[PDB]
Design goal:
Shape of chain B: extended
Structural class of chain A: alpha+beta
Helix content of chain B: 10-25%
Radius of gyration of chain B: 13 Å
Organism of A: Escherichia coli (strain K12)
Order of helices and strands of chain A: EHEEHEH
Helix content of chain A: 10-25%
Strand content of chain B: under 5%
Entry title: CryoEM structure of E.coli RNA polymerase elongation complex bound with RfaH
Oligomer: part of a larger assembly
Chain A: Transcription antitermination protein RfaH
Order of helices and strands of chain B: HH
Number of helices of chain B: 2
Number of strands of chain B: 0
Largest interface: A-B, 2 and 4 residues
Number of strands of chain A: 4
Structural class of chain B: mainly alpha
Number of helices of chain A: 3
Radius of gyration of chain A: 12 Å
Largest sheet of chain A: 4 strands, antiparallel
Strand order of the largest sheet of chain A: 2-3-1-4
Keywords: elongation complex, anti-pausing
PDB class: transcription/dna/rna
Distance between the termini of chain A: 22 Å
Shape of chain A: globular
Chain lengths: ~80, ~50
Amino acid sequence: QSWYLLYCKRGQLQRAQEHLERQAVNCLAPMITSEPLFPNYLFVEFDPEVIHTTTINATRGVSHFVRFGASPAIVPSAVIHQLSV
Amino acid sequence: MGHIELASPTAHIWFLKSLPSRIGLLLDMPLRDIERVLYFESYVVIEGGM
RNA sequence: CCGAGAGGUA
DNA sequence: GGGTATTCGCCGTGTACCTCTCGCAGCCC
DNA sequence: GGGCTGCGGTAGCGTGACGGCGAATACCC
């Protein structure tokens, strides 16, 4: 289970997070104070053998992965730790 | 005319992909690796030093 | 009064 | 190391005019 | 009511042109 990023559709982060909460996928998005601190970006945690990235990409409210190339970006665990503000 | 202050510098696509690349055979660096540096999936060194 | 699609004249 | 030789991927593909329709839905913010 | 925005989905859609030319690269020295 490694951490990925998802760019959601504009103004659908609540619905995307709701569907990914009905699946077993961890979501992470800082709330600033109530609007999110970041834009439509969202951090998911799963495993591509348990739930596949195509199923994540076809979720209601998820536009795409932050890819940078072929494979979607793994964000390191120091970043996910340092979003615990 | 007006202008937009692009908060990141941004490559002109005409001088990147005119076949041949002007940045490509200006830097002696292949067009694939320049597109991998520009689209944030690889790094290139500037002044490696010691 | 800009674009697209369909049809037609030479 | 560089010489053939194949593959990839960009270029291009007539002129003038006439008529008609149709041109954002979704939408969760 | 509204900003804006590229599909709508818990995937896959694509699928009937053809040539020329030059760079990128593969195979075999």
